[PDB]
């Protein structure tokens, strides 16, 4: 029972650590978006970065 309780506690801490991983309201790892695109040239070409849900 003590081991399963510690296991559930760590499983909740994983949820909280994944939830807090934002930078100014945007996150590449919390799973709210499929990808982020950043500027790569003056004409507006994207620099795609696929999201990795955690």
């Amino acid at each position: 029972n003590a081991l399963k309780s510690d296991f559930d506690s760590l499983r909740d801490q994983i949820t909280k650590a994944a939830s807090n991983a934002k930078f100014n309201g945007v996150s590449i790892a919390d799973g709210t978006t499929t990808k982020l695109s950043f500027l790569a040239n003056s004409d507006g070409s994207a620099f795609t970065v696929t999201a990795k849900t955690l």
């Binding site: 309201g25 695109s37 950043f38």
Partner: protein, 55 residues
Amino acid sequence: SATAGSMNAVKDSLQRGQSTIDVALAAGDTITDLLGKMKEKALAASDTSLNTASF
């Protein structure tokens, strides 16, 4: 003599046209600077990573 003396009006009109073109060039310098700033603003706005307030 009347033909030679009539040229002063032509010179005056040419100077007035040069002055008008100069004022237009000053306004054009201002307009190109504003257009370049709008370029940088739209290019910054294209990025998907910004939050709503920056947009």
